[PDB]
Design a protein around this ligand. Structure first.
Ligand SMILES: [Zn+2]
Ligand SMILES: [Zn+2]
Lengths: 434, 434
């Protein structure tokens, strides 16, 4: 409910706004380490125990090959909607391919950067009661485009043990190879180390909850030889609204984020004068009462806050400091403010572009950096699933011309074998002129 | 000396060749962790103390604004060599800028991905017994191209408290804003947390020794809010050689990697037949005893190994498994095999392209993934210094076309607030034209 005016604040007060409520992950590591170690040591049996324990389901086989599962049949309207998403997500991400053009800054010194897919990747889509086929498209489409050979999707089952069929449809469309019917730390460990039946993966994506996230943090510093997309905290939106924003559409934007759960973070920034803060707030109350996830949204909004900025430059400056997962800019001429944005996972410009268009189908990626990590991490993209290999090839003339400079730098550095690798080659070359 | 043949080996045995020796991080962690904490709590005073103990230097001004440092004067061959290097590294990295073309897969649905620099960055360049201006260019040039506002270059001082003069030259050329005259874990903490005079940075780059590396690793899972380039181990080279390779050149390539240190890892893969392995081992021995760092190279070569492959495909396949920091391909028609390489930091094709060319001046980046982390990490590049923000903007028509698909997918996921944010908007649009 809290309201702040940027003119009222000291440098110390600013800073407490920039930082999210502390999550002590050390605490969460203590809970997660035994689970990670158990799966590491005892494999599928251990995974089955934790799945029985936490998801209250007992599994025969925790992994299946997706190409052996039947094509599920969906309501045609539902199917077409996910085909549209797929199509837009596919096109946005395919357009991120780098051309691989060679640089020749001196004659005969040809260098280039080429993309190779990460061979094996693991994707975490939360499950049980959550039905998250959208996240499945977000992780698997760019994997598919990148060409990854093994694609493990981890998706904890419903209370009976049934795979969410929309997720499965999405997984089949994006070439997921393996479906791992587990969640939690236990699923992260199984992909990081591999098991009797779950392939070992080289990189793991999707933030899951704070327990998934902790295991990812832990396993990236372990011997498992696994990298992750990014660390994480709760989901967030920051909305900037000016007097041209419709109060009820602003309210709906706040609740759209709030309904993700009690820990979602909402920030309303009011840029300029003439905005009816009251109407927005009342409109939030009215809309919240009919939401089936209204209890979640209300718990979330109990630690939301409002910020008054006297102008749009101040609003954006505050948003840059904050570094929001999602940024909504509902102000006149929103597009013009783009070159002022420095830190945000994803940006929604104007009045017709709610967060859920990006959550589902605009084509951008919704697995975005939270907690302030947009300061140095990007949302998942095609490049998240590639390594770039640098290549250089010299001709004789190139080495003739570049070698001496190399000789010089190696001497300066005290590295004489580095020098001789070149000199010995130059001797051979000069020896073959008569 | 030690040799293997790919035909003679079991699965069990290949997998042993793939994996590097384990490093005891536990002992390193015991050293590093209280250093980090101490710098976090006590700032520059804590840093001064550690510099005094390990580097044996007592210095009051540990952070220097590079602007008001006088240009060093170095001999002119040396200036000219680093200038060529600067030029090739610049050109190579500048060619990596993405176009930011908008995607419009459905009329009025406009999406894009824009580059924004990481606002502050830290660059680690080893000192004391090392002199590493090449690394200064490798880290600093793409930061400068990326437009990072604060660039902190950590480099421990020489015994009199001065900065290594070649390193300072490269920092001024590449636009480093601050110089932190400290090394080791204490340097890393100072950049990760900020001190009284050292700016806090968002990302830290550069291998260092195992103390630096452990500090980077701890700090990436800490509350400091800092990412890292990549984890790391000892540097490595894998050289693929066929019968057309000149044995002495092959030997000088191995020594070039080996002279880095006793842990530097070296692998020779002999592909096909007609290769004088003896001439190569003889040549390694003559060359090794005529080197200043010959004792370092010999210790490294004691844990080197050879692999015989019946053909080049099998050689490449083995190399793809091993996933070397550096790969040299000295075979016939080396360029043609490019498409078969899946895992390698940087590649050197043909007879005239030694590792040291890439270490110094080809333009590629020498800060590369070791220990098999080439399976999922790239070398440092322009992208390492950027976040890519995704942007979407819808017209009214765009939302009229895409919104209904989104309402449905929101229904499926049980996320009514996500649906309503679209519906209120579609209602407003409908109200207006009637
Ligand atoms: Zn959402
Ligand atoms: Zn080197």
């Amino acid at each position: 409910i809290k309201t702040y005016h940027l003119s009222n604040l000291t440098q110390t007060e600013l800073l407490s706004l920039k930082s999210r409520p502390r999550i002590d992950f050390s605490s969460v590591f203590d809970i997660v380490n035994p689970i990670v170690d158990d799966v590491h040591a005892h494999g599928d049996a251990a995974v089955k125990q934790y799945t029985s324990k936490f998801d209250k389901v007992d599994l025969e086989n925790i992994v299946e090959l997706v190409s052996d599962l039947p094509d599920p049949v969906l309501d045609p309207a539902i199917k077409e909607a996910f085909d549209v998403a797929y199509s837009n997500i596919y096109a946005f991400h395919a357009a991120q391919k780098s051309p691989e053009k060679s640089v020749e800054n001196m004659k005969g010194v040809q260098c280039k950067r080429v993309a190779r897919s990460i061979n094996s990747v693991g994707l975490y889509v939360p499950g049980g009661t959550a039905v998250l086929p959208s996240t499945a498209l977000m992780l698997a489409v760019p994997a598919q485009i990148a060409g990854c050979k093994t694609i493990v999707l981890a998706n904890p089952p419903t209370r009976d043990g049934t795979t969410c069929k929309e997720v499965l449809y999405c997984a089949k469309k994006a070439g997921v190879t393996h479906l791992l019917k587990a969640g939690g730390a236990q699923a992260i460990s199984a992909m990081a180390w591999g098991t009797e039946t779950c392939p070992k993966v080289e990189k793991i994506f999707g933030p899951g909850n704070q327990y998934v996230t902790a295991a990812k943090m832990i396993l990236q510093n372990s011997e498992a030889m696994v990298s992750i997309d990014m660390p994480a905290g709760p989901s967030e939106v920051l909305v900037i609204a000016d007097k041209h924003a419709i109060p009820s559409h602003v309210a709906a934007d706040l609740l759209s984020q709030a309904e993700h759960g009690p820990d979602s973070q909402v920030v309303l920034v009011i840029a300029g004068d003439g905005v009816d803060q009251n109407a927005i707030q009342e409109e939030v109350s009215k809309q919240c009462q009919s939401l089936p996830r209204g209890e979640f949204a209300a718990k979330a909004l109990s630690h939301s806050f409002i910020v008054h900025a006297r102008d749009m430059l101040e609003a954006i400056t505050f948003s840059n400091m904050y570094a929001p997962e999602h940024l909504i800019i509902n102000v006149k001429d929103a597009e013009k403010w783009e070159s002022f944005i420095e830190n945000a996972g994803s940006v929604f410009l104007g009045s017709w572009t709610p967060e859920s268009v990006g959550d589902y189908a605009s084509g951008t990626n919704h697995v975005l950096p939270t907690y302030g990590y947009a300061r140095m991490y990007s949302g998942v993209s095609l490049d998240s699933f590639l390594k770039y290999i640098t290549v250089q090839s010299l001709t004789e003339e190139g080495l003739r011309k570049l070698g001496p400079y190399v000789e010089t730098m190696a001497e300066v550095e005290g590295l004489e074998a580095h020098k001789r690798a070149v000199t010995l080659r130059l001797q051979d070359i000069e020896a073959r002129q008569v």
